[PDB]
Design an enzyme around this catalytic site. Structure first.
Site, short mmCIF file in Angstrom:
data_model
loop_
_atom_site.label_atom_id
_atom_site.label_comp_id
_atom_site.label_asym_id
_atom_site.label_seq_id
_atom_site.Cartn_x
_atom_site.Cartn_y
_atom_site.Cartn_z
CE1 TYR A 509 -2.66 3.35 1.89
CE2 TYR A 509 -3.88 2.29 0.14
CZ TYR A 509 -3.70 3.36 0.99
OH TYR A 509 -4.54 4.43 0.93
CB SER A 592 -5.79 3.09 -3.45
OG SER A 592 -7.11 2.60 -3.39
CE1 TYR A 593 1.92 5.95 -1.85
CE2 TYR A 593 0.47 7.86 -1.57
CZ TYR A 593 1.74 7.31 -1.65
OH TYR A 593 2.85 8.11 -1.51
#
Ligand SMILES: *[C@@H]1O[C@H](CO[C@H]2O[C@@H](C)[C@@H](O)[C@@H](O)[C@@H]2O)[C@@H](O[C@@H]2O[C@H](CO)[C@@H](O)[C@H](O)[C@H]2NC(C)=O)[C@H](O)[C@H]1NC(C)=O
Ligand SMILES: *[C@@H]1O[C@H](CO)[C@@H](O[C@@H]2O[C@H](CO)[C@@H](O)[C@H](O)[C@H]2NC(C)=O)[C@H](O)[C@H]1NC(C)=O
Ligand SMILES: *[C@@H]1O[C@H](CO)[C@@H](O[C@@H]2O[C@H](CO)[C@@H](O)[C@H](O)[C@H]2NC(C)=O)[C@H](O)[C@H]1NC(C)=O
Ligand SMILES: *[C@@H]1O[C@H](CO)[C@@H](O[C@@H]2O[C@H](CO)[C@@H](O)[C@H](O)[C@H]2NC(C)=O)[C@H](O)[C@H]1NC(C)=O
Ligand SMILES: *[C@@H]1O[C@H](CO)[C@@H](O[C@@H]2O[C@H](CO)[C@@H](O)[C@H](O)[C@H]2NC(C)=O)[C@H](O)[C@H]1NC(C)=O
Ligand SMILES: *[C@@H]1O[C@H](CO[C@H]2O[C@@H](C)[C@@H](O)[C@@H](O)[C@@H]2O)[C@@H](O)[C@H](O)[C@H]1NC(C)=O
Ligand SMILES: *[C@@H]1O[C@H](CO)[C@@H](O)[C@H](O)[C@H]1NC(C)=O
Ligand SMILES: *[C@@H]1O[C@H](CO)[C@@H](O)[C@H](O)[C@H]1NC(C)=O
Ligand SMILES: *[C@@H]1O[C@H](CO)[C@@H](O)[C@H](O)[C@H]1NC(C)=O
Ligand SMILES: *[C@@H]1O[C@H](CO)[C@@H](O)[C@H](O)[C@H]1NC(C)=O
Ligand SMILES: *[C@@H]1O[C@H](CO)[C@@H](O)[C@H](O)[C@H]1NC(C)=O
Ligand SMILES: *[C@H]1O[C@H](CO)[C@@H](O)[C@H](O)[C@H]1NC(C)=O
Ligand SMILES: *[C@H]1O[C@H](CO)[C@@H](O)[C@H](O)[C@H]1NC(C)=O
Ligand SMILES: *[C@H]1O[C@H](CO)[C@@H](O)[C@H](O)[C@H]1NC(C)=O
Lengths: 728, 728
Positions: A509, A592-593
């Site tokens: 992440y 996402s990130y």
């Protein structure tokens, strides 16, 4: 040598974790759903009466999504026709059921399409939002009073947040706050007039002939933000012959000279309210403390009582300024602030004295303040064993700061190192939730003497089934770079033999203040990959991660897409060193990130990775929302940080994808990380002539969370990884 | 055993076909560009002067997209700043160069962003369209006269077509027609007020922060169509003190009773214009013949001169009613209409006599009428050898219908069976283009005696290079089902050994009146697949295909997605029978309708195919445009054909994809077959839990034709096919 944890086991959910969700109602009792009968339990002795039966609403005629009982037990609110919006927002229809009179309230009901409903914290007053305006009901059967008249779809929001406030500041749709005893209703108002719209196609059932264009006020980085105002109204002097007087509390003047946000509201007494503001450049924030003024009937915010908070090394708070917890008389409060060694600890404030006193210090952070009694303060920290990925309940003696008892460390150190807590209305009792590394364990306790009363749930049901299957194991350890420790975790295949060369998937992440190396017990895709495919699934918390103080967290300030990606690649190298990793089979994936980092990594041509998968990645920061992006990057202007915005896109690294196999996946109806981002990546790769794999998800959003989509994606990802690793 | 035709050979375009594009200017001369010097050639003797040099515009300052010379040779129109819109439409900027005075015209110029420009057919009058209004220039340097004032972006179109008229009726952007000597300018006007919009995201350069929403008036099947009006204006009586007068010509009353289209306009004399109208239910059409009325200044269409054309078995025309060709005095005309045996032949009409006389019959169709002299009519037909996929120039004696000479059959039967022709201004001369099965061969001829004058181009340059490479061969043959013949073609690998088991890729279009089995010479993806990968690339013209009469063509009337798909699957079976095909390695692919059929086939669970690729497929007919869709399906209402609309989607077949490997590809900025279609397929497959492959193309439209996208897709497809066939 039995069966393994299979992809189907995960997808079909064959092995289920039991929970023990209880909602406290007094200092002595709590509620709990059991075979669809809500039961009231007696904290002390453990006996339970049936409070309401799965029977009561057999012939309601509607499918019931959720309930919510008035604080005074007399009524019960019924939520149906649930239609999801963003992460927290949705609309529903509601009905109120009288518990004394065993009946539904038939007249003066809550409108269909209500956006938010909430009880007052005591009694049975009601406040709800409908077409962006606030209404109050003193009695469930009486006519509701209209509070605001300005509400206007996608322009003026009264009592509810717009897109970016819901997602990035309040983590809630709700934007109204009752005073403790229900006298006052405070609320925020959001003006989105000049906030530009994101637009994207929605396709619906194949019966829909022309695609719908969804359009949403959404400020991308450096674009025009919403503006906010704050009001308090007295529900006790409501008229029905006069429009309600809403009283505004203006922002501080220091905030008014430019864009800002309202970022915390917390009632302190019956007549005192505290507000936290934050400048668009999120390294300066101000707290106001406001008192009701009997002779004026407005709110006085004594500037003497303000408290400035700022940071020189990064932004304020982990994601925003922390919330204050006040003492009963409301003259002092506790709040988590970063000390000068850069560690997040509990600070102790006097309303009018300008400094504060730290009541904890150490090489570890306080995760959150949980409860406040007259002489004890309870909090969660990652102190025990000095492992950041751990999580424990502590209590501190208010009259003596050296007297710190650890309420959970010892309870079962082998099975339990990650706790959360839920206290009763006055903290007579508390429920611990242990969530790793063993199977989750819920227990009850009385605060008076810290006696463990009983075991609420222990998942022994699951424990049985699980020794029937070859589970993987989890190692939590660290490595050392520049004599600071950085933690990693590895999901290791059953019968892990440290002398063989395993293929490794790096699970990333890497977002600011993130933590992917912890002691939680998880049944997920990685479990399958380890168990059935013998892949080590590893995560690594590098620079930028949280819970280890600002020197690690703020290390990526104004500089996103650098240190956090380089540390990830580094961690990969270190794992090769460890010896049990197949060099020529390292993969990386994230969402996402996580997708951004994955992509940035794959794009760096470090040759460490054979392949990766990016799910809903950010591709360049000018596309993501302002509140998040700017918190770390500042503004994309030449006077500020435009250069690093431009120096940190995925597309500029397109060329290097020539050395890796890539999978791009993105939901078309993604309101958060817009499909645009992936669309820009594909284009970039096409232009430079790089082959890759792709997958869109029609009408899925950022969750790709709908039942069949969820199964489909993990399936598609699994094949990708298997072929990338040459597993059969 | 030298090198093969590789994927790179195709993509990089290493082996290039030469053309001989000439534009006739008189009965005796023509123009031809040659390393950028336009030269005028003398048809008779072959000598050539330089007409204009690559020099003339060295310092124009702008890159020149195209030229266009006034019919009277005096001026030359220069087209630059080309910006493409749909298939035929675009905007450009223009400059007129005086050839006498060797200068550019500096004042009263043509606006930037002009949508259409055209000369009068004689002299140097100009007509152009700008912001949807028509302007006329009598002299290039003089002020232009405004004709229409109603033009309004995406609402009112004067002199240009809207989306659906451009794509499905006129195959042109232009919607204005000069009378032969330039006296009159006729034009159409389109009102799109209530035509619903298709909307989709366009992402642009990554610098563009928020995606643009393109929105386009586009009538999907059964939706609200544009309405049309027709006007004629006299350019000789233009004022500059008065707004110029446009005589309207109403549609036939029999048309005004419901939705209709204007579908052909053809000038007949200096003062006579013919118009063809078509009812929205496209099986009834009417021709009006209108005369200028000096006495009223208006246009008179005697109802007595109208000509009603209709069909009971299907729709009128191949794609629309055929165009008439009039005799010089304009009292009679020739037109291709289907006879009662169902074959398309040339019919001969008298303006006021209600019947017509066929001047050809046979078991073959006339492809088109090419030229009309005082005693000869020239046309192209597929008569020779009785092969529909062939194409030859014939001439018929007007004074004797039995005297039919074939002008091209014999010229070189081995190399040439597919011809087109370009006549000189009075048909003194003609240029034949032979395009298969040998390398293309352009020659010149004089009509007087049909003498072959010389060889213009013969591609011997290419012929050289091509014996250096192991080319594939093409077999054109037929099979018999229900004692009618259906033609197939196969691109066969070099050294084709009929005793081995080859993997086969079925190349499909299958659209109504399509023809994928012909005698054209092509260098394409299929060439690579056969040459380098030893895959037989086969196509099959089944029911619904053209050029074989209505019993085959109309067989799918109102019943799209049936017979044409079943005949494709059948053809595959037949190829297995042939013995040289690997049973367990049959694939199918196609684009547009081709993608639809591919998908329908893959979805039928006939187990004949291992895998397929659909590029920009239609997925359900309610999504495609009205003019095309309804031409074959009628209206999607319960009173009409709603049931078959619903019974013929791809998504209902989703379940059966469980038995095949599938690749879905679609450009996101596809204005024609909207991305929506593929988006509905993916969704359907996800929902029923079928794995597949997918690829979007950011900002590409229906062509996926941009340089790098074009290379990327064929590359991606090639890998897919190779892995599907287990090829290195
Ligand atoms: C759960 O049971 C209690 C009573 O049971 C306990 O009483 C204690 C005094 C102790 O001796 C213990 O061993 C014993 O098991 C219920 O408490 C009751 O509360 C109400 C009065 O408000 C009455 O219903 C009862 O008379 C009273 N009991 C006593 C003896 O005080 C309690 O109601 C019940 N809780 C539920 C909701 O299940
Ligand atoms: C919310 O919407 C519902 C459903 O559209 C409305 O339901 C109708 O209510 C009236 C009751 O008098 C009847 O005419 C119908 O029988 C109802 N339909 C159904 C299926 O129950 C309802 O009135 C709306 N409720 C509120 C609070 O306004
Ligand atoms: C809840 O708190 C409110 C706010 O203090 C109380 O309201 C005040 O009541 C006292 C009377 O006992 C007055 O001094 C004030 O004028 C009131 N404030 C106003 C104007 O709202 C209230 O007593 C509390 N309890 C209730 C009523 O539920
Ligand atoms: C083009 O044809 C038109 C008509 O077909 C010719 O002009 C008209 O016909 C005669 C001959 O001049 C006149 O009686 C009318 O006044 C003309 N009509 C009008 C007002 O335009 C014209 O001569 C032809 N021009 C060319 C290029 O030969
Ligand atoms: C155009 O085609 C339509 C539909 O195929 C024909 O109408 C059908 O044929 C007969 C006679 O009208 C009826 O029994 C059917 O009910 C008709 N169907 C519909 C929906 O119209 C029509 O004959 C054709 N020609 C026209 C426009 O007159
Ligand atoms: C081309 O040549 C024309 C000259 O006429 C003679 O040309 C000889 C080549 C020969 O064949 C004779 O039979 C001809 O009578 C001339 O008049 C044309 O104008 C020239 N055309 C161009 C464009 O140069
Ligand atoms: C309250 O406010 C609204 C809008 O300003 C107005 O239309 C309405 O008449 C007001 N009601 C009373 C009681 O004055
Ligand atoms: C906030 O951060 C920015 C960027 O480094 C800088 O302009 C400014 O000095 C900081 N301001 C305060 C008050 O800390
Ligand atoms: C201009 O045309 C002549 C052809 O005869 C050629 O020699 C010259 O180099 C040309 N330049 C270009 C741009 O082809
Ligand atoms: C058209 O555009 C260019 C660039 O804006 C301008 O300089 C030119 O003079 C314009 N004039 C015309 C041709 O109408
Ligand atoms: C011509 O037409 C337009 C639109 O109807 C009108 O505004 C204009 O004034 C007219 N002027 C002339 C030149 O006759
Ligand atoms: C829910 O209803 C009853 C009511 O007491 C409960 O005991 C039972 O477990 C549930 N009913 C069944 C058998 O589904
Ligand atoms: C020390 O810091 C990082 C790890 O924190 C290390 O990899 C790097 O090479 C050293 N310093 C830097 C980033 O200049
Ligand atoms: C002949 O036409 C098709 C072609 O394969 C076939 O399906 C059909 O069964 C045959 N005959 C009849 C009576 O439809």
């Amino acid at each position: 040598s039995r069966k393994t944890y299979t992809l189907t086991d995960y997808l079909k959910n064959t092995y289920r974790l039991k929970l023990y969700s209880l909602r406290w109602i007094s200092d002595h009792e709590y509620l709990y759903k059991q075979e669809n009968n809500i039961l009231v339990f007696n904290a002390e002795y453990g006996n339970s009466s049936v409070f309401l039966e799965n029977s009561t609403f057999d012939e309601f005629g509607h499918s019931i999504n959720d309930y919510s009982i008035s604080p005074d037990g007399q009524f019960i609110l019924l939520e149906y026709n649930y239609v999801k919006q963003w992460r927290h927002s949705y609309t529903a229809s509601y009905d109120i059921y009288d518990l004394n009179k065993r009946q539904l309230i038939t007249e003066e009901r809550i409108p269909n399409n209500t956006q938010w409903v909430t009880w007052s914290p005591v009694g049975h007053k009601l406040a709800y939002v409908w077409n962006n305006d606030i209404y109050v009901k003193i009695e469930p059967n009486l006519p509701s009073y209209r509070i605001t008249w300005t509400g206007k779809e996608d322009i003026i929001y009264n009592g509810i947040t717009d897109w970016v406030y819901e997602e990035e500041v309040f983590s809630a749709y709700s934007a109204l706050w009752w005073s403790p005893n229900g006298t006052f209703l405070a609320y925020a108002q959001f003006n989105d007039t000049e906030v530009p719209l994101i637009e994207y196609s929605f396709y619906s059932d194949e019966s829909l002939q022309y695609p719908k264009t969804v359009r949403v006020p959404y400020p991308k980085a450096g674009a025009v933000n919403p503006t906010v105002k704050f009001f308090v109204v007295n529900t006790d002097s409501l008229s029905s012959v006069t429009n309600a007087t809403s009283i505004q509390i203006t922002a501080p003047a220091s905030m008014l000279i430019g864009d800002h946000y309202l970022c915390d509201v917390t009632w302190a007494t019956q007549e005192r309210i505290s507000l936290q503001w934050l400048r668009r450049i999120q390294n300066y924030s101000v707290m106001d403390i406001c008192d009701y003024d009997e002779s004026s009937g407005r709110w006085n915010c004594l500037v003497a009582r303000q408290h400035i908070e700022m940071s020189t090394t990064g932004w304020v708070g982990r994601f925003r300024p922390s919330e204050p917890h006040f003492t009963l008389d409301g003259n002092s409060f506790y709040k988590i602030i970063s000390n000068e060694e850069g560690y997040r600890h509990i600070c102790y404030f006097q309303i009018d004295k300008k400094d504060c006193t730290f009541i904890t210090k150490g090489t570890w952070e306080v995760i959150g303040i949980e409860a406040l009694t007259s002489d004890y303060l309870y909090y969660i920290s990652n102190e025990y064993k000095g492992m950041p990925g751990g999580r424990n309940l502590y209590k501190i003696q208010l009259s003596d700061y050296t007297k710190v008892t650890c309420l959970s460390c010892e309870l079962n150190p082998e099975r339990c190192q990650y706790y959360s807590v839920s206290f009763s209305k006055e903290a007579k009792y508390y429920q611990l939730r242990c969530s790793g590394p063993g199977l989750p364990l819920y227990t009850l306790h009385s605060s008076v003497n810290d006696k463990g009363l009983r075991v609420l749930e222990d998942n022994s049901a699951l424990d049985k089934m699980l020794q029937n299957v070859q589970m993987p194991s989890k190692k939590l350890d660290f490595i050392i770079l520049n004599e600071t420790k950085f933690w990693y975790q590895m999901i290791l295949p059953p019968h892990f033999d440290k002398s063989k060369k395993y293929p490794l998937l790096l699970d990333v992440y890497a977002g600011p203040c993130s933590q992917k190396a912890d002691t939680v017990f998880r049944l997920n895709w990685a479990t399958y990959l380890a168990s059935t495919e013998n892949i080590i699934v590893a995560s690594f918390d590098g620079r930028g991660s949280g819970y280890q103080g600002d020197k690690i967290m703020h290390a990526i300030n104004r500089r996103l897409g650098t240190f956090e990606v380089e540390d990830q690649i580094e961690a990969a190298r270190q794992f090769s060193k460890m010896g049990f990793v197949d060099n020529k089979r390292i993969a990386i994936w994230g969402w996402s990130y996580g997708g951004y980092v994955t992509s940035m990594v794959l794009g760096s041509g470090s040759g460490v990775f054979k392949c990766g998968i990016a799910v809903a990645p950010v591709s360049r920061w000018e596309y993501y929302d302002s509140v998040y992006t700017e918190r770390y990057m500042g503004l994309p202007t030449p006077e500020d940080n435009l250069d690093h915005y431009r120096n940190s896109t995925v597309m500029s690294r397109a060329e290097n994808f020539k050395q890796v196999e890539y999978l791009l996946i993105h939901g078309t109806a993604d309101d958060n990380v817009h499909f645009q981002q992936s669309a820009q990546i594909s284009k970039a790769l096409v232009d430079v002539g790089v082959d890759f794999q792709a997958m869109w998800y029609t009408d899925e959003d950022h969750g790709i969370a709908s039942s069949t989509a969820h199964q489909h994606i993990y399936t598609h990802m699994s094949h990708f990884i298997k072929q990338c690793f040459s597993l059969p």
